[PDB]
C-alpha cells in the first residue's frame, strides 16, 4: 500500500530556478501558450539520473499534470529507456518552458536570449552532480539546443558525452493525416530509433535493470508503449492520469476559445 | 519579480503521510470522488503556521490546483485570516480527502476508523510544532472532526487550544438559490463570522500583520475577498488560477458523464 511520489523543487539549485523563471519578456505572450505557466521537468532531481531526455515542448496533458512528456511522446520516450534497463533513473527537461502557439511556431524564437539562457542553467543543474551518462534529444530544436549548450562556456565539459539526436516520438502522426503513410513513417523512425539504442547502450554503464538489448520491429508492440511511473508526478495524482489512454484535450468553437479551455476526462472504468 | 511557491511535500513526517495514503478501502468509491486522488493541504509545512483552518471537503477548482481552499470558500477564508493579521501563518486540511459524493452528505462515514485515523496523523503532524495557537473549524463536519481528534490519546493535549467554529463560507449559496435569501442568510452568517473574530483575535498573539479587528457588515466587500497567496501553490501555476474569477467546472450531459469530467476556462484578459 505504498504509493511514491516525486516532491519536486524544495533543493537548491532547483527551489531558486522555479522562483525566477521567465515569462513574456523572453517568451511571446502570442506565440507561446504562456498563460498556462512554466512546466520544468520529468524524473529525478537528487543526482541519480543516467540519462537526461531533451524535448521540446509541452501540451495539454502536462499542463494539468505539471510534469513534461507525459503524453503519447511521453509513453513512447519512457519504452525507449526501458530497451535501454532504464527504468527511473532519468531526467527531462524541454526547450521551451511552454508550449509552442501555432503550427511551425520555430524556430521563430528559439534564438531568444530570455529563453536559451535559462534552459542552459537548468542543463547545468542537473548535469552537476556529474552522473548522467547519455544524453538523447528528441526532435531537431532540441538537438539544437544541445549543442548550442556545448558551445557555451559551462557546457564545454559535455563534448565528450554520449549524445543522440532521435526523431520526435509524435513525428509519424503529425506528418500525415493518412494511416497508411503513419505506418511507413513509423517504421522508418523505429529503424532510426534502433541504431540511436546500438550506439547508447554501451555507455549506459549502470542500469536500473541489467537488459540485453530488443530492437523494435516496424510498429510499436504494446509492452513498447511503457506508463510514467507514480514516482514522476506530484503526491495525490491518480493513477489513470499516468495511464494509457488520454485523458485531456483542447476544447473550443473557435481559435480563441480552444486556446482557452482543456476539458479533462476520467476514462471508463475507474468510477465504480 | 520572484513568485514564490509551495515546495510540498519531501520532509518527514508528511512525505510518509502522502505516500501511505488511504484509497478504496476506508473511503466508499461511490460515496466519496476517490477517483480525482488526494488533496491534503493548504498552507505552511515548516512550523510557521499560527492558525490552523479546518474545512470540510475539495471541489473542482482543488482538483486542479492540488491544494486545499482555493475556489470561493478559500477567498473568503482568506478574508476571514487576514482580518486577525494573518497573511500566510496558517496551515489548512480538510476533514475529508476527498469530495464527498452526494449531497445526501458524507455525515454518513464520518465515523469510519480509516479515514478518522488517517486525518488524525495530519493533526498530530502539523500541531506537533506546538506553534498554533487558534483552531477554526467550517462548518459542522469539520466541527465534528476536531472533537473527534481531542477525545483520542494524543489529542487530549489540545482541549485548551483555543476553539472556534465557524459557519461554512458558502453556507448562504446553498442553503438558497433566490437572492434575497442568500443575502439574508449572508448576513447571519457574519454575525456569526463576527462572534468568532472578537474571540479569536486576543487569542492570536503573532498576526504577520499587527491588525485592528474590523468587523463585518451585512454582505462581503470586495477587500474582504482575499486572493490565495503564490507561496501556497505549486511551482510554475499561473497567477489567473489564483485570482477571483472562477475558472474550473464539472460538466457533463448526465450524473454519469458529470462525474467523469472537469472543465477549466481561463478568464478573459489573460490571454493577449
Chains 1, 2 share one sequence.
Not at 503513410?181 to 540511436?196: E, G, H, P, R
Amino acid at each position: 500500500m505504498l504509493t511514491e511520489f516525486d516532491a519536486g523543487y524544495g533543493e537548491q539549485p532547483f527551489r531558486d530556478l522555479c522562483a525566477n523563471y521567465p515569462g513574456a519578456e523572453a517568451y511571446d505572450p502570442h506565440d507561446f501558450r504562456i498563460e498556462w505557466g512554466p512546466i520544468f521537468h520529468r524524473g529525478r532531481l537528487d543526482g541519480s539520473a543516467r540519462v537526461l531526455i531533451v524535448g521540446q515542448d509541452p501540451a495539454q496533458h502536462e499542463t494539468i499534470v505539471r510534469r513534461i512528456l507525459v503524453g503519447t511522446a511521453g509513453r513512447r520516450t519512457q519504452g525507449f529507456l526501458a530497451k535501454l534497463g532504464i527504468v527511473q533513473s532519468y531526467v527531462m527537461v524541454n526547450t521551451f518552458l511552454y508550449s509552442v502557439y501555432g503550427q511551425s511556431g520555430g524556430s521563430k524564437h528559439k534564438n531568444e536570449p530570455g529563453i536559451v539562457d535559462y534552459r542552459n542553467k537548468w542543463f547545468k543543474a542537473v548535469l552537476g552532480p556529474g552522473n548522467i551518462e547519455a544524453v538523447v534529444s528528441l526532435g531537431g530544436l532540441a538537438d539544437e539546443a544541445w549543442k548550442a549548450w556545448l558551445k557555451s562556456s559551462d557546457g564545454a565539459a559535455y563534448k565528450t558525452l554520449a549524445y543522440q539526436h532521435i526523431t520526435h516520438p509524435t513525428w509519424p502522426e503529425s506528418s500525415a493525416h493518412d494511416s497508411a503513410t503513419q505506418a511507413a513513417n513509423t517504421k522508418i523512425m523505429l529503424a532510426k530509433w534502433n541504431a540511436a539504442l546500438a550506439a547508447l547502450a554501451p555507455e549506459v554503464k549502470h542500469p536500473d535493470v541489467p537488459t540485453t538489448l530488443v530492437p523494435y520491429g516496424d510498429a510499436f508492440k504494446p509492452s513498447e508503449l511503457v506508463d510514467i511511473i507514480a514516482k514522476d508526478l506530484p503526491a495525490g495524482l491518480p493513477a489513470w492520469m499516468r495511464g494509457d489512454t488520454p485523458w485531456a484535450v483542447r476544447q473550443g468553437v473557435d481559435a480563441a476559445a480552444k486556446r482557452r479551455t482543456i476539458m479533462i476526462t476520467i476514462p471508463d472504468g475507474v468510477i465504480p
